[PDB]
Design a binder for these strands. Sequence first.
RNA 1: GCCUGCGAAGGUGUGCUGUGAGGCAUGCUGGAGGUAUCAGAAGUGCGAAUGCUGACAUAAGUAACGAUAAAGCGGGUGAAAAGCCCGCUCGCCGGAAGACCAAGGGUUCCUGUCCAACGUUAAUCGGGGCAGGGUGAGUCGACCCUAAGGCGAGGCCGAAA
RNA 2: CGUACACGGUGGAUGCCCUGGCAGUCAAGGCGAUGAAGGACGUGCUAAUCUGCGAUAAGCGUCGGUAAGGUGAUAUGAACCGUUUAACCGGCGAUUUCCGAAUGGGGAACCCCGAUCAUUAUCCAAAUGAGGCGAACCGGGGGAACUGAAACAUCUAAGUACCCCGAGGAAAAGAAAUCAACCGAGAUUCCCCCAGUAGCGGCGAGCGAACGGGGAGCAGCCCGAGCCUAAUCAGUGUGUGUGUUGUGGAAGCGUCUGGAAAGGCGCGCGAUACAGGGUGACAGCCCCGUACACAAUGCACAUGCUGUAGCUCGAUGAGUAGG
Lengths: 92, 60, 99
Amino acid sequence: LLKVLRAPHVSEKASTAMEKSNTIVLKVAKDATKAEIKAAVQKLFEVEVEVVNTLVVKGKVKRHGQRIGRRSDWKKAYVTLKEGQNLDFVGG
Amino acid sequence: MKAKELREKSVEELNTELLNLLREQFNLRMQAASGQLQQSHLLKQVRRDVARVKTLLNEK
Amino acid sequence: KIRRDDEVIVLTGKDKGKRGKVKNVLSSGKVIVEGINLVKKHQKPVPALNQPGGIVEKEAAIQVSNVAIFNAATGKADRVGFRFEDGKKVRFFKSNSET
RNA sequence: GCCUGCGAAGGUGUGCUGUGAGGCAUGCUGGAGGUAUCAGAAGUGCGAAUGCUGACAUAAGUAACGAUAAAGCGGGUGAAAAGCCCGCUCGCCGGAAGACCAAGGGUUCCUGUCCAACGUUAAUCGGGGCAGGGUGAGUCGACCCUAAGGCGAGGCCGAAA
RNA sequence: CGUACACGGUGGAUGCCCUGGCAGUCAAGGCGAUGAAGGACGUGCUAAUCUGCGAUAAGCGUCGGUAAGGUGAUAUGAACCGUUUAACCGGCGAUUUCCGAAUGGGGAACCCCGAUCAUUAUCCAAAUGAGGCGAACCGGGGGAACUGAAACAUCUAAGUACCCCGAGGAAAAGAAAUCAACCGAGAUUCCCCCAGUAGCGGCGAGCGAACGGGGAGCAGCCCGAGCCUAAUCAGUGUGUGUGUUGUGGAAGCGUCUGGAAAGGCGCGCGAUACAGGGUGACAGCCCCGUACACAAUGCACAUGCUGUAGCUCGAUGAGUAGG
């Protein structure tokens, strides 16, 4: 269930999808491997999940002169649609 | 909920609670989508709850 | 010492004779009492000193030297307000020497 | 055994005294403490090591900016525009200042708002400052293996990394 | 443009203050493969640092203390918690992802498993040990040079620097085939003295004890047999003297200066408690604190006790003494 995911999407970019083409965009935490993003969505999103892909990402230290740069960003995943319903709402 | 309440609950009650709180641990996640009724109190409280019950579950 | 849950009585400032409770105490020694306030521009009941400028602290800036709480001496002051759950403090409060 | 916010130590200028090394007083300032006697004390009293460190003057408002030697004429915007933008005209480069990339650097990319700091002038310009956005592959690369060679384990050497 | 000064600036000395160092003293004293120290990287609504934790992430639970104020340093904005008595302080418990000496193997933190040596061995790693860290001190080995001798090969610096191995909170030594003023002393170290004497030395420069005495601390015993039970061993119960915090805690007085006294001046006081700090300017009698009092923990070194269990007889260690 909703434990690893941020903003649903943005304007023209994550909007071009979900329109009519079975696909969904949604930000998610970084510590999220493949276990979730299929076990936080698809659960109550009123839809079973499509070829599922759960990406991850993170930057790196540096960037400045003496400080605590060390960091680890966070990573959304593309979830197309199994052929059914577009999360009940959000879409065309 | 306080530790006292969880301890009183049965093994199944802690499971249904963890699950209820688990199902509960879903509703929120809507701010980034542009919500309002989302409260910051339970944001941090709920994670502790599902955890508190999780600690006692092992204590048993 | 001085506490926030106590009432003070002015004796020198132009607010001499005014009564009120202690709003708050700063690590500066000054104490703002509920009553000693000033009239701002747009006439807003807010305590502050009398001097031109931009942004300046509130409070009328009273001094513990001209105040009147529980002074063990002959003065013109009278009664003054003062915890209770302590118990031991109740004994001192009962004594006409301390509080 | 005394002096002090009816104000001290210190500092500046000045008066007096001592052979002097100095003491002392006045005015201004400072505005917190500071002395005399006898006695003991101290890492004690200093211009002259191509001395050490920091600061500063004269020198100088003197020296310097040079094969890709190209800007110019109008116009636009602006409080300011000789080098921000438009048009025309005039030129440079062509294995090259073109196009695609490795290593390396690393967000410096794009948009908006500005410029105090950076740009050997100015700047309403920027690879500058601030806030956002951008790098969505099974078939691209990593990931995997191996060559010279190296390492760990058993065998053998006072001992052993 | 010379020189002095005045006003302002540059600059930063000086005077004062200082949440810091330096030094001495008392107490206390190990951590880890139940995977520590350290580091990496997360974590607070915003936080870039530091600190605290670590994905129940500057936090969770219990008991006790404490207390209304609290949500670390930053006194910001927003905002939360607390009397279903929090914050804070002390102890303890629960949990504690992945990587990580980890050892399955490789590897600049990423992917799959008890690796290696060794003992026991139901030879099945099945049951165990070693493999790391830590300020100095300590024990057992290896072992210089420059330098001094105003040269230098003995000597000297050195048995030091450094290197190898290892224990503890303490080690090493040690009960005498010793000492040797004596009808005597009499386990071994350490401190003082005896000695800078004896002794050594191109006897050149230099080098350099011990016996004894005065002290600190005192403990003596075991390896063939006979016999029988209080050495020893195994186990059990389990301290007196405490650790931190809170409670029993007096006290702005007068005049003057000032925005304010922790000023000047006047007066009084504490003391089996004559450190220091804080509070609007030099307050031991404003606040904390100093002597003091009480409760929470750790250590509980010892003792007591159960079953073992005395005591007795003979001898006493050869490739050694010695060359």
